[PDB]
Amino acid sequence: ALRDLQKLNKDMVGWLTIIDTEIDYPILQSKDNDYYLHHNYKNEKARAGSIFKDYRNTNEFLDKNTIIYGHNMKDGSMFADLRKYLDKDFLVAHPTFSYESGLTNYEVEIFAVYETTTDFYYIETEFPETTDFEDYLQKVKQQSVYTSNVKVSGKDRIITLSTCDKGRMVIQGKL
Amino acid sequence: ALRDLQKLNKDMVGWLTIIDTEIDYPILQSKDNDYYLHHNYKNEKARAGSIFKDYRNTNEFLDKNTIIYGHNMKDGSMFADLRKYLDKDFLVAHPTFSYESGLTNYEVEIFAVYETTTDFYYIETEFPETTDFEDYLQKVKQQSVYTSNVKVSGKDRIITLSTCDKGRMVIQGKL
Ligand SMILES: [Cl-]
Numbered sequence: 402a403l404r405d406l407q408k409l410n411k412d413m414v415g416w417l418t419i420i421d422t423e424i425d426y427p428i429l430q431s432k433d434n435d436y437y438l439h440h441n442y443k444n445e446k447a448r449a450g451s452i453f454k455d456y457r458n459t460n461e462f463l464d465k466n467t468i469i470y471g472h473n474m475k476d477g478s479m480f481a482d483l484r485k486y487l488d489k490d491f492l493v494a495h496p497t498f499s500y501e502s503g504l505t506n507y508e509v510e511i512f513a514v515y516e517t518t519t520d521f522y523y524i525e526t527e528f529p530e531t532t533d534f535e536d537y538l539q540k541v542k543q544q545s546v547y548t549s550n551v552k553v554s555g556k557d558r559i560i561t562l563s564t565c566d567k568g569r570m571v572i573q574g575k576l
Numbered sequence: 577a578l579r580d581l582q583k584l585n586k587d588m589v590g591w592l593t594i595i596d597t598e599i600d601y602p603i604l605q606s607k608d609n610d611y612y613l614h615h616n617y618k619n620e621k622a623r624a625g626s627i628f629k630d631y632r633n634t635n636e637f638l639d640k641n642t643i644i645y646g647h648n649m650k651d652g653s654m655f656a657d658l659r660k661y662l663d664k665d666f667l668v669a670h671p672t673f674s675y676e677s678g679l680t681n682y683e684v685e686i687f688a689v690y691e692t693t694t695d696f697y698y699i700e701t702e703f704p705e706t707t708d709f710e711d712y713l714q715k716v717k718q719q720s721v722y723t724s725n726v727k728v729s730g731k732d733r734i735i736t737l738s739t740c741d742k743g744r745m746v747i748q749g750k751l
């Protein structure tokens with residue numbers, strides 16, 4: 402049982418909490434974007450899976466776009482509550498959430514909210530230049546269902562919450 | 577029970593393993609050098625306590641001397657096995673151990689081993705200059721029961737394993 406505890410300490414890479422939702426979960430991470438679709442935080446088979454960080458994101462300080470995935474569970478668990486952000490009332494009352502990494506906590510300031518079925522541009526993690534990230538931000542701001550008070554520049558860094566399972570639900574916020 | 581999991585994710589700051597010992601434990605940490613003398617990794621009252629990192633050590637990259645504490649338990653658990661290093665045969669066969677932090681793993685190269693009852697110079701964590709850490713290293717090398725092949729300079733950084741409860745047992749190694 403302490404073998405399982407050592408496993409958990411490598412696998413769990415953070416914590417996520419959004420007030421007034423079920424989303425209050427450990428963030429897991431493996432070598433791909435698949436294992437934690439099908440396993441819980443104890444590494445046992447489970448359809449609900451876990452909340453998990455994209456395998457490409459391994460540097461908080463430099464990653465321009467860190468992506469966290471979870472199922473849109475029909476029982477309302479995992480990332481089903483991301484859809485509350487399509488209700489304007491909820492968004493105004495919850496402009497931020499908290500994201501812990503392995504080091505420390507951030508209060509993320511949401512600036513874009515949308516659903517998407519076939520346009521997955523938002524999953525880019527690699528930006529040769531600072532100018533490439535500003536093109537990215539322009540595109541995803543335009544994809545948003547709201548115009549945001551929050552301005553954000555190619556100099557900022559962001560975090561993306563996304564379902565992974567018709568359309569995905571996506572929330573993006575400024576670190 | 578997920579409230580307890582969130583607690584554990586802030587409290588557990590690393591992992592320690594020394595081959596051929598019981599020492600294969602999570603490293604915990606609180607705001608002082610006392611809580612984890614009396615509580616286990618689930619934060620429940622327990623005499624064995626936990627293995628824990630000195631509250632003063634909060635920066636892997638700059639801390640010249642990171643100290644990890646555990647009880648010298650009479651049932652052979654926790655840090656009772658540190659005393660195996662007074663047997664030369666064991667030390668030759670185990671010149672290193674592994675220390676995980678919140679970020680990553682190190683293979684620590686042991687360079688000093690001793691018991692101490694009243695001379696606690698080794699617990700210094702603050703070194704104004706690089707010259708102060710070289711004075712420190714000179715003192716603790718002299719305190720060692722062996723002369724070490726491993727040389728270490730004021731430019732290196734170290735990790736200290738120590739019991740905490742007649743004498744403490746102390747192992748110090750190069751990062
Ligand atoms: Cl679409």
Ligand SMILES: [Cl-]
Nearest residue numbers: 692693694695
């Ligand atoms: Cl002494």
